[PDB]
Design a protein around this ligand. Structure first.
Ligand SMILES: [Mg+2]
Ligand SMILES: [Mg+2]
Ligand SMILES: [Mg+2]
Ligand SMILES: [Mg+2]
Ligand SMILES: [Mg+2]
Ligand SMILES: [Mg+2]
Ligand SMILES: [Mg+2]
Ligand SMILES: [Mg+2]
Ligand SMILES: [Mg+2]
Ligand SMILES: [Mg+2]
Ligand SMILES: [Mg+2]
Ligand SMILES: [Mg+2]
Ligand SMILES: [Mg+2]
Ligand SMILES: [Mg+2]
Ligand SMILES: [Mg+2]
Ligand SMILES: [Mg+2]
Ligand SMILES: [Mg+2]
Ligand SMILES: [Mg+2]
Ligand SMILES: [Mg+2]
Ligand SMILES: [Mg+2]
Ligand SMILES: [Mg+2]
Ligand SMILES: [Mg+2]
Ligand SMILES: [Mg+2]
Ligand SMILES: [Mg+2]
Ligand SMILES: [Mg+2]
Ligand SMILES: [Mg+2]
Ligand SMILES: [Mg+2]
Ligand SMILES: [Mg+2]
Ligand SMILES: [Mg+2]
Ligand SMILES: [Mg+2]
Ligand SMILES: [Mg+2]
Ligand SMILES: [Mg+2]
Ligand SMILES: [Mg+2]
Ligand SMILES: [Mg+2]
Ligand SMILES: [Mg+2]
Ligand SMILES: [Mg+2]
Ligand SMILES: [Mg+2]
Ligand SMILES: [Mg+2]
Ligand SMILES: [Mg+2]
Ligand SMILES: [Mg+2]
Ligand SMILES: [Mg+2]
Ligand SMILES: [Mg+2]
Ligand SMILES: [Mg+2]
Ligand SMILES: [Mg+2]
Ligand SMILES: [Mg+2]
Ligand SMILES: [Mg+2]
Ligand SMILES: [Mg+2]
Ligand SMILES: [Mg+2]
Ligand SMILES: [Mg+2]
Ligand SMILES: [Mg+2]
Ligand SMILES: [Mg+2]
Ligand SMILES: [Mg+2]
Ligand SMILES: [Mg+2]
Ligand SMILES: [Mg+2]
Ligand SMILES: [Mg+2]
Ligand SMILES: [Mg+2]
Ligand SMILES: [Mg+2]
Ligand SMILES: [Mg+2]
Ligand SMILES: [Mg+2]
Ligand SMILES: [Mg+2]
Ligand SMILES: [Mg+2]
Ligand SMILES: [Mg+2]
Ligand SMILES: [Mg+2]
Ligand SMILES: [Mg+2]
Ligand SMILES: [Mg+2]
Ligand SMILES: [Mg+2]
Ligand SMILES: [Mg+2]
Ligand SMILES: [Mg+2]
Ligand SMILES: [Mg+2]
Ligand SMILES: [Mg+2]
Ligand SMILES: [Mg+2]
Ligand SMILES: [Mg+2]
Ligand SMILES: [Mg+2]
Ligand SMILES: [Mg+2]
Ligand SMILES: [Mg+2]
Ligand SMILES: [Mg+2]
Ligand SMILES: [Mg+2]
Ligand SMILES: [Mg+2]
Ligand SMILES: [Mg+2]
Ligand SMILES: [Mg+2]
Ligand SMILES: [Mg+2]
Ligand SMILES: [Mg+2]
Ligand SMILES: [Mg+2]
Ligand SMILES: [Mg+2]
Ligand SMILES: [Mg+2]
Ligand SMILES: [Mg+2]
Lengths: 127, 205, 260
RNA sequence: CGACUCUUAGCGGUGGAUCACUCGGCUCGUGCGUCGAUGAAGAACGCAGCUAGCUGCGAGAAUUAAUGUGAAUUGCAGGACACAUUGAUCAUCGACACUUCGAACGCACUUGCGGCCCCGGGUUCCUCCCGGGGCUACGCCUGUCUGAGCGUCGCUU
RNA sequence: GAGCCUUGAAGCCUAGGGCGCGGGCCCGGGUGGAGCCGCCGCAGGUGCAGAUCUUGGUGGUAGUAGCAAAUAUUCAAACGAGAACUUUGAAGGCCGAAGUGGAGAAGGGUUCCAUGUGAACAGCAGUUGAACAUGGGUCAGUCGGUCCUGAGAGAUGGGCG
RNA sequence: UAUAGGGGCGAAAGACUAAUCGAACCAUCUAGUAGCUGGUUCCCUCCGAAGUUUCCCUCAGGAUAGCUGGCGCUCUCGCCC
RNA sequence: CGGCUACCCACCCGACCCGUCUUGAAACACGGACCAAGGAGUCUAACACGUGCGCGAGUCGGGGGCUCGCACGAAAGCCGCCGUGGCGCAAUGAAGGUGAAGGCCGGCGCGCUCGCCGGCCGAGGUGGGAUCCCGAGGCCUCUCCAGUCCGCCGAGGGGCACCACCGGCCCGUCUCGCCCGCCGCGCCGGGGAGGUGGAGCACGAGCGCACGUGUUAGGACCCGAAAGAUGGUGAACUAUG
RNA sequence: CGCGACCUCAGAUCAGACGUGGCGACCCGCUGAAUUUAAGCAUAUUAGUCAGCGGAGGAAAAGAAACUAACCAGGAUUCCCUCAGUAACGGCGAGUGAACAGGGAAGAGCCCAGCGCCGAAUCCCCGCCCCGCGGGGCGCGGGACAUGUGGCGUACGGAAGACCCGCUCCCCGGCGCCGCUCGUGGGGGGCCCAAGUCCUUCUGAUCGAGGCCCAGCCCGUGGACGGUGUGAGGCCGGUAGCGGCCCCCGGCGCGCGCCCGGGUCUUCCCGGAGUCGGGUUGCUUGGGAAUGCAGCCCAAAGCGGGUGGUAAACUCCAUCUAAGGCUAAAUACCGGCACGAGACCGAUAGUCAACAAGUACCGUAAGGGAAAGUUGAAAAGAACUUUGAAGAGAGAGUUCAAGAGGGCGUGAAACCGUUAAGAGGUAAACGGGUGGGGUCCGCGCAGUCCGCCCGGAGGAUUCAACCCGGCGGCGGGUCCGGCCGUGUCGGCGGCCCGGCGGAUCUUUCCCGCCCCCGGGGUCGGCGGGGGACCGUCCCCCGGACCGGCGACCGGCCGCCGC
């Protein structure tokens, strides 16, 4: 139950902050869980997704065994786009299907020194 | 406009009262504010007790409330001089000082003097440097407490004179009848006119 | 309202220009200029009886009636038929009002709380609260209340030592204190007989806090138990007693209908 | 027999009532106390690559610098793609900058007409000569400079 | 109420079945796609046929009145799918110098000009326009403002408040 | 350019003062008051009027009494009086 | 085969278009072209009455205080040497002020249209008055006998509430007369008998909360004016320099 | 004649510094109506408000008595409950309307002119040195103000000067570091628990029962939001005296500058003036023979002046010391910056405005002032063929759905078009009664009833009839073994190893005290503590009643499945 009186339970205020949050808040909003072997190996629950993360989709029209690399992250639309996931238009032009990153299981992260510092802070705070 | 048998009503609502409506929606808000004010005072200010300065035994001026008793304001400088301490030294000790309060009664004089003796007996002071003026060792493990509640003495002290056992007595019960009040009333009404008639009888020879 | 539709300055026409006698906003170009002004029957107008802030909201109750309602709710919580008719699952539950030991009030983890409810068979009522946590019916979903979370058992205690932490996120439970008995928590919805779980110190402190009919309440100042209107109130026993049936006329059960 | 008129039902047509939703109001309560002569509130004009409005800014003009976070903004081409160099966006903003009118302040205001001081080139210098920079409103306080009296007085002709 | 359900809630329609005397209600059938109801208590901004009722929409009138102030148009060709109306040739007329002519002040603000479209505008029409979209256009020592005072408006000194 | 609202101006009509002038326009007091028109929203059941006395600057109104409804209380019958 | 029905049609009979001002409306009285949404007796304060609950000669925490910081907690619980205070328990007077118990028995002073001493009872009497109490009497398949058994009543009695009357007490005035006490013997106080005025007493029933009706003042069931005041804007029309 | 000093002044684009203007919800100062009521209207009420003007602060104002009271007296201002709809004002009509107590929040008190004393011991400015970080403040030398009066000592509660007495030894303004603090000091950044598993629907799941006898996992975290629907676990978010870092504020502890108060006696000083007050006149008040303010005139006193609620004279008494000033707290806030909640509203409601809203637009101007939300899960917004020049259309395609095709959720009424059925000279429509037709509903229409008992025909079963074996329930007697409920005594036992209350006591108990002659006197009186007695709980044996919702064992009749 909410006990701190300086945070809202208001539906209008929560939806307002959610649909008008800036991009550095929207990065925290668009976070994705990890696979079970990768969370066993890194001791972390979830990570924010970036341009070069490999993605297995668990739910939707495309489900399972489709590990592909993402290409675009529209934080305005709360939508990542995956290279493997395709859909043809009327005129034979392919286009990427909108997938929300909360229904996204990351199988391979991107190695960077900044992400190593983030992962170390996650592991130290998870303890 | 009027009706059957009901009381004549004159409400004071002809003035535009709707603008000035003060409704206590913030009454628990003021309660929480004043709780936090008292708690912040007792934390940050001192180990002095809440309602810090001591109040006197005071009789209420009326023919209605003068049988009762009241916590006054200050200790009535003649009383404070009989207790024998300086004015601002008393104010820093914790004695509340009012320079206006007079003394008509030696009874109330000695009552406030004995109250000052009791407060000086119950006083435990803490100077800064350990040169020991008016202190000693760790007195009563820092006097077992820090802050008292609502006066150190409970300054009401509703005195209970009892006078239980006495024998029915002699002709006082035949002498203290109703006629004494009427005689005193008539003497108070006719105290001056009898003096004028005595002056006129002494003048006219 | 506090600032009604009286922002629009308007006057009425009168005899000629025979639309109506209602005031009309005056201007040009804008197609509102000429429409209905303030009033109850107009578009965008001042409503009838603008609900002012000085309504008589809060209602004082006599403290004797407050304590009377607390005693009535606690007495109705003891009868099994009343609480089963309110709907708590008291099938496998042991003896009425349950008194647990003093080791219960010092719980820290809520796994011990769930295990205690499973061993004291209130877990059936907690499972009913799990089974009924549906969505709010009506427009009240907009103002942050979207759950029909029905009330279950309430645990009444003293000496808070972590029992609020152990009972804090169980659905349907109610944090309730002996020195602060809430009518709104002991009898929610105006219905009596809510399932309650006491403690040793609670069940021994009730008699100290209210008293019997012999002694007064020692914790309160000037409270006694109320007058009991019917002492031995078994109406079937009274009407089947020999002293009452000795003084009856006769059983007259003939009908004597209409004769054609 | 058909045409016209009336009542139902099915389907179709301006109409957006009802139902459902809410980045909106309304009410109540708490916390803090905050504009300006070091140019306030307000207004005019301008600024995006494609940019009318709202929003954001002031010739450094869709933001500059710094800190924090950490791979984007996005409708479209381009641009930095670098991170074993410094790093895109976003928020904070504590450093710079903030056109004109506006208490508006050189005059009333027609972006006109001046007056001092200094600096660059134009006959290497004022003499009503171009550009740039600073100053030039009223009242008043303290102190400085100058002078007005047949206001009062000292010394001398 | 271990209530109802995306195997279909609210809403709406119904030559379907029924109940209650009536307020109304239940079920069936058709669209709809996410919330709804029953009992017990509680509180209302709680029921519409009217008020020259307010807002919004729609009929009869009705394809009706009306497209009639100022003498008038006609033939051929051309771009064009399309011409009583656009453009040109020709003919006949009007305005007839106190103009239906050539330029100004106030006012308008891009309406001026070219190109393209013709759903929208022009009370029919357009291939046309002052409509729409794109791109252009206003160059001063010697034209005027700027200078001056006119009727008048105005700040300081002063006075009032 | 000057005269601005009980003010201006008028060869005088009370005419003109931004389609309004025998007292302009906009906003506020203001949701001014009205004994005066119009309207006042679901069903069923029971009971059910008056247009009269007196008074009032009273005569389209109100007060009082009368007519009416609701809520009860005190009793009485069921067994030669 | 059956079927009433928000389907359609025909036939017989009755049937003027609703709402309200009115004595009278279908009216040649007024509003209404049609349809959808909105739309009019609310809220506060005060009073009175009725009802429901709690306590009850008391009642009430609305003003504050106490709990550990809690979403519901702007709730709730408690104060009691926090009952200050409101209402009620006492009224009458303009006021000084005064302020609700009498009855029975014995003795005493001339039981004298007259007071004292001692004891007892205690909110008076009359006529009705629900109810309640005592009880003559008689009634149960054959006899003397009994206990509860079936089983009421003539008559008598104490009398709730309340009504009607009489009587008593208290307060302010009116008339008539006498007596008593002295922290001081006075234009000092007190007392008696009668008829009056009071919203009185004559064993008190109030306080708090809630609901319903009615009235008042607040915009007060909704809409409506000719008008008044305050502060600003216009001589681009027109009037005159 | 000239030079100089002082006093009155002018100038400057002299050096430095200050006020203008805006918001104005709360607060302060002025003045300021009428609609309305009084059923009429003048006094009155509206109202000392609305409008107008001038000012500042997070509060403002007020604030240390020229006070209240009249007795067993209190003692700054503010705010609340009472006082109280009362005293009182009012064509005493309508109506208007306080105050002192008393109980609470808050508590903080002071300074100056005069009087004298200090050789102006005082302040402003200029120039250089001593100085530390992010920056300006003490000390050296000369230019002014000020003797027509700076500063210290002083404040009506008395103060000052000189002896006597025992004493007191000191403060506040800096600077680096160490451990803190009640939310575990301020705000900001970044992070932290636990199914996305097996089966089945669905376009999609967050739907649907289950995850071994330990309830599959987490919980101090099951608030809320987004995610293709209805999630505690899939995601930042939620709990936590949860952790790590940076920035800021505070009280401890080394330098620099100042530092005689109390009691007795003697002497001296001891106060705010066109001001109070009086007359008169306006506004206001509840304030009346005038509460306050103001205009004019008259205009002081020093055992004085004011107040003492009925004008005035005489007398007595109570209280205060005005015409100078400051001061935080409780209190108010519809403006503003963030903030949390809602028995509120749902695009004709709620702010005028959910949206490019004070916008479009109107009036010369003051000013007036709108309408307007929704496709889908994602545009995947209809490729391509074909008629027409296009608008548009027929195929085809995406989507669960085009019956969602760019103002596109749902799609009624008024009204219109077509089809089907029926009808038509008394305008249409209606009530009662039937009839005919049509849609639809239930069923098989010469064939539809069930439940029990008994007499007949085959079949397979096992109990029941009686008993043994068994646990569980009903009933009552010994109230048998024992708990407990109602009134009663007793151990006065827990009275000192006990709770509650008593204006009932104990002056031969104690302590702090007064009085009379360190001691004595209950000789009399005040407060607190000890305990004597009165009405209820805590054990017991002995006993009466129901064994009554208080229930076990022992035994009995009558139940019951296996
Ligand atoms: Mg909200
Ligand atoms: Mg009436
Ligand atoms: Mg008014
Ligand atoms: Mg208005
Ligand atoms: Mg208003
Ligand atoms: Mg509105
Ligand atoms: Mg609904
Ligand atoms: Mg619309
Ligand atoms: Mg930068
Ligand atoms: Mg320059
Ligand atoms: Mg219903
Ligand atoms: Mg309504
Ligand atoms: Mg509502
Ligand atoms: Mg309607
Ligand atoms: Mg009607
Ligand atoms: Mg109409
Ligand atoms: Mg029409
Ligand atoms: Mg025609
Ligand atoms: Mg014709
Ligand atoms: Mg024409
Ligand atoms: Mg041709
Ligand atoms: Mg051609
Ligand atoms: Mg010709
Ligand atoms: Mg000419
Ligand atoms: Mg011409
Ligand atoms: Mg052109
Ligand atoms: Mg063209
Ligand atoms: Mg046309
Ligand atoms: Mg154009
Ligand atoms: Mg030239
Ligand atoms: Mg002037
Ligand atoms: Mg001047
Ligand atoms: Mg005027
Ligand atoms: Mg006037
Ligand atoms: Mg005109
Ligand atoms: Mg006139
Ligand atoms: Mg006028
Ligand atoms: Mg009205
Ligand atoms: Mg009459
Ligand atoms: Mg009447
Ligand atoms: Mg009657
Ligand atoms: Mg009746
Ligand atoms: Mg009439
Ligand atoms: Mg008539
Ligand atoms: Mg009629
Ligand atoms: Mg007519
Ligand atoms: Mg008519
Ligand atoms: Mg009509
Ligand atoms: Mg409606
Ligand atoms: Mg009552
Ligand atoms: Mg009292
Ligand atoms: Mg009262
Ligand atoms: Mg009106
Ligand atoms: Mg008038
Ligand atoms: Mg002109
Ligand atoms: Mg003229
Ligand atoms: Mg009237
Ligand atoms: Mg009038
Ligand atoms: Mg007045
Ligand atoms: Mg004002
Ligand atoms: Mg200002
Ligand atoms: Mg400020
Ligand atoms: Mg002040
Ligand atoms: Mg009156
Ligand atoms: Mg008044
Ligand atoms: Mg003083
Ligand atoms: Mg969700
Ligand atoms: Mg969730
Ligand atoms: Mg998580
Ligand atoms: Mg004196
Ligand atoms: Mg005097
Ligand atoms: Mg005097
Ligand atoms: Mg006197
Ligand atoms: Mg007097
Ligand atoms: Mg003073
Ligand atoms: Mg002052
Ligand atoms: Mg203050
Ligand atoms: Mg809608
Ligand atoms: Mg709108
Ligand atoms: Mg979307
Ligand atoms: Mg479907
Ligand atoms: Mg649609
Ligand atoms: Mg749809
Ligand atoms: Mg939807
Ligand atoms: Mg339709
Ligand atoms: Mg047909």
């Amino acid at each position: 139950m909410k006990f701190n009186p300086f945070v809202t339970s208001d539906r209008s205020k929560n939806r307002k902050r959610h649909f008008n949050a800036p991009s550095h808040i929207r990065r925290k909003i668009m976070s994705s869980p990890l696979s079970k072997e990768l969370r066993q190996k890194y001791n972390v629950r979830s990570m924010p997704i970036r341009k070069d993360d490999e993605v297995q989709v668990v739910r939707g029209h495309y489900k399972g065994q489709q590990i592909g690399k993402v290409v675009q992250v529209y934080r305005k639309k709360y939508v990542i786009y995956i290279e493997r996931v395709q859909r043809e238009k009327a005129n034979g032009t392919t286009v990427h299907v909108g997938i929300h990153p909360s229904k996204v299981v990351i199988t391979r992260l991107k190695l960077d020194k900044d992400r190593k510092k983030i992962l170390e802070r996650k592991a130290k705070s998870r303890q | 406009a009027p009706s059957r048998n009901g009381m004549v009503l004159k409400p004071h609502f002809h003035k535009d009262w709707q603008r000035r409506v003060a409704t206590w929606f913030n009454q628990p808000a003021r309660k929480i504010r004043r709780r936090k004010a008292r708690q912040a005072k007792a934390r940050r200010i001192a180990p002095r007790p809440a309602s810090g300065p001591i109040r006197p035994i005071v009789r209420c001026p009326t023919v209605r409330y003068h049988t009762k008793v009241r916590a006054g304001r200050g200790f009535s400088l003649e009383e404070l001089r009989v207790a024998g301490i300086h004015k601002k030294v008393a104010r820093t000790i914790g004695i509340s000082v009012d320079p206006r309060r007079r003394n008509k009664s030696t009874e109330s004089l000695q009552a406030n003097v004995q109250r000052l003796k009791e407060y000086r007996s119950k006083l435990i002071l803490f100077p800064r440097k350990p040169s020991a003026p008016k202190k000693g060792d760790s007195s009563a493990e820092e006097l077992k407490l820090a802050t008292q509640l609502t006066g150190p003495v409970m300054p009401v002290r509703n005195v209970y004179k009892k006078e239980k056992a006495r024998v029915i007595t002699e002709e006082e019960k035949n002498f203290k009848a109703f006629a004494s009040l009427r005689m005193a009333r008539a003497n108070a009404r006719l105290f001056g006119i009898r003096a004028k008639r005595a002056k006129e009888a002494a003048e006219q020879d | 309202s506090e600032l009604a539709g009286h922002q629009t300055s308007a006057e009425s026409w009168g005899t000629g220009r025979a639309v109506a006698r209602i005031p009309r906003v005056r201007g040009g170009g804008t197609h509102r200029s000429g429409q209905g002004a303030f009033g109850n029957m107009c578009r965008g107008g001042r409503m009838f009886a603008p609900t002012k802030t000085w309504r008589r909201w809060h209602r004082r109750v006599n403290t004797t009636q407050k304590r009377y309602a607390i005693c009535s709710a606690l007495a109705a919580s003891a009868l099994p038929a009343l609480v089963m008719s309110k709907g708590h699952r008291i099938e496998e539950v042991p003896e009425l009002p349950l008194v647990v030991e003093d080791k219960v009030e010092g719980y820290k983890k809520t796994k011990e709380a769930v295990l205690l409810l499973k061993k004291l068979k209130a877990w059936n009522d907690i499972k009913k609260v799990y089974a009924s946590q549906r969505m709010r019916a009506g427009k009240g979903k907009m103002r942050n209340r979207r759950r029909i979370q029905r009330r279950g058992p309430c645990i009444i205690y003293n000496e808070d030592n972590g029992i609020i932490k152990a009972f804090r996120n169980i659905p349907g439970i109610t944090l309730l204190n002996v020195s602060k008995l809430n009518i709104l928590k002991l009898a929610p919805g105006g219905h009596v007989g809510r399932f309650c779980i006491w403690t040793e110190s609670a069940f021994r402190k009730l008699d100290e806090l209210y008293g019997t009919w012999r002694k007064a309440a020692s914790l309160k100042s000037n409270y006694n138990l109320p007058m009991h209107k019917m002492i031995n109130t078994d109406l079937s026993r009274i009407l089947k007693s020999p002293e009452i049936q000795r003084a009856l006329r006769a059983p007259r059960k003939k009908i004597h209908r209409r004769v054609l």
